[PDB]
Symmetry: D2
Subunit: 234 residues, 4 copies
């Protein structure tokens, strides 16, 4: 049996009824998903915002031994008043349908220091204790510490085009980022067992936090988004 | 700007988290959407069940003057112990996202005698006072009385393949039904202004009722379903 | 699994992915003008066909796969005299090296002792000896005589929206025509075994002819076209 | 708007929608074997290419449209001697009447004084005079010398998953390669103006060559392939 879901937005409607907005997240009158707070054109500290697609996604099925393959593309911008003081980052993620925002700052709204099923591809702009020294793209499986990462030449206020795919038959999760402005790209892949990492139905979407001090502030804006998932026989 | 949503199920999972089940509706362990009650292999009277896709669908936008085109296919079966005593019918419909079940029997769970924004394509098995004498396929715009209908040679317990499309630029809503078992088909079309009939965001899905007397009973089972909607510039 | 899909909202003049035959041409406004027009008028004795450049794999013996496909297109037949129409337009599948066959009533598809492999849906505007009395939408399997038909109320000069689908698992071919100006619709279906009518690979497209008398002339214009075929395990 | 999409999970032997050139063939197991193997061994001096039968409309001057496209495929290069590999495999776009050009290091794509229109992503296994020192994934615009490249750690006999996309609005061509056995990935991007490198219509596909010495031999097998292109108003 086959179950396929697809969606695509070239720009978000300012009152998006098929997106669950959490924390500080909102859609601007020009159709930008602004995950973290912006006040008089400036990003604010201690901000956390997430946004999930309304329909839960069937990513595996015990009854029938199927596991989903999926892919997603999106464009985002992280713009910082000071390039030397960037925090904390933006992620694409999958979590249980009732998922709520979790700790702020370096925990990216995804994880906490207290409990969590979430798989995430993170675009981390600040080196915490569990991080490598550089900014990086990471693949995260039920932990804020990445299972694998690649160093990331972040370009302030430039559009980044991301493509993420999961191939169920090989358990391979791949994440790429490209800046058309200078045609530079980064990629990372990992072997991930979605089936032991997540429940059978998840919601998908984005999460981002700005830094916990006034001077570590940046935007996390998502400009568009496509997603497709197929759950079918092995 | 463009917003596109697609989904497709070749069979429903018995605990479908992306389907809102209402009234008596359930999914059988073999993956049939059984809208109305079945007890020891027999359909029960006074049953009403509906099922909606979890994500609201953006069908028009005042801000930008877009109106969606959409299409849907599904297969259904209506099986009656007595061919001379069939009631009441099954429909595909669009309604506001918070839509709840409405009156039973000939009102098909869609409309009532008390208030309703709903557009529906109905497969009516019993001739009420607002109906033509024969069983029929109808196009319904905010009323249980159809705006147009075609006579319908219902085939007891046979699979019916339906295709419904809405072409926004011509405001044309078309509904077809085909029985592969005897290669017989029916079609009806109508001019419909989705924009004045419905709010900007709707949910879509199915509704069905069995008759209000013990002897007017039939099943309303949906076997599979695909849906696609595109909201883009004129 | 092999899937092919293509979609044109209008045609490019000199389209390299369409094989044009006989008189067919694409106009500067992007219409596929299958039969000749000069000054402003359709001309007699014209025949034109257009096929998509890629062959389509419609069945595969080595794996017992049989394709399901769907096509949609919109066409116009304009006649200077309503009572003197000929001969019609058809969508068809034939072997990839298919060449134009008889003009006039044979629609460029067939011939009275050749054995021709071609499956077509015809929109016949002139009642030949082998035709029913009125204008008709017919399903034809390797013959100009239709295996099933439905009476067609042709609308002069008006856009017709056509949808054709073939469900492999039931061998059901369905053809529908809707005039959006009028919200008037017609449908016909037949059990057709593609496997025995046609080779494994076919070329799909259109064919039309104008009458063989100077007075029985009409245009046969295609305005858009989308096609999808899937060859998968049953 | 013109969209074309095709997808093969394996190849049919004698595929009528693929133009095979030089030594290319499809095996009974459904592999696209671009270079010759006899007994069990890859043979020297082999060249094979395969193109999809339909030309693809990649730009249109008359409307200032430029296509965005994406392709994914998985390939294997197996060598009996790890230290003696040549020459490589490439995905490419060229004019529709494209014919095989030089063997060996020219990959069947190029030639040292012809002016050849061909855009390619190459997976080069042998360092010629114009190449960097190591095995490399290169972007090539009408020359065998790559405009940009990234070092490629080839894995002998292992399945590589490739994704290539071209974003028209930024003229960004990106190419990624992932080994799912290893979860190891590589990416390279370049600004490429398709409009000036290539004609309006192209044929897409693959080309590969084995070394010109008897000792520098390897296979070049393609296992699947999906392609989508959209030509739309900017
Ligand atoms: Ca961090
Ligand atoms: Ca009724
Ligand atoms: Ca005729
Ligand atoms: Ca080389
Ligand atoms: Mn990190
Ligand atoms: Mn009714
Ligand atoms: Mn006829
Ligand atoms: Mn090279």
């Amino acid at each position: 049996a086959s179950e396929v879901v697809s969606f695509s937005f070239t720009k978000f409607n300012p009152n998006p009824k098929d997106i669950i907005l959490q924390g500080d997240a909102l859609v601007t009158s020009k159709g930008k998903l602004q995950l973290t707070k912006v006040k008089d054109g400036k990003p604010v500290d201690h901000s956390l915002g997430r946004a999930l697609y309304a329909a839960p996604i069937h990513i595996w099925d015990d009854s029938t031994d199927r596991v989903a393959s999926f892919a997603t593309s999106f464009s985002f911008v992280v713009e910082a008043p000071d390039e030397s003081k960037t925090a904390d980052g933006i992620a694409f993620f999958l979590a249980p349908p009732d998922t709520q925002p979790q700790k702020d700052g370096g925990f990216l709204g995804l994880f906490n220091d207290s409990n969590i099923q979430t798989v995430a591809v993170e675009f981390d702009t600040f080196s915490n204790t569990w991080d490598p020294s550089a900014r990086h793209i990471g693949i995260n499986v039920n932990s804020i510490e990445s299972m694998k990462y690649v160093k990331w030449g972040w370009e302030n206020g430039k559009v980044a085009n991301v493509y993420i795919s999961y191939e169920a038959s090989t358990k391979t999760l791949t994440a790429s980022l490209t800046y058309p402005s200078n045609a530079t790209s980064y990629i990372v892949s990992a072997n991930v067992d979605l089936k032991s990492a997540l429940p059978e139905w998840v919601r998908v979407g984005f999460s981002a936090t700005s830094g916990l001090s006034r001077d570590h502030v940046e935007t996390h804006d998502v400009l568009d988004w496509s997603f497709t998932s197929t759950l079918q026989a092995p």
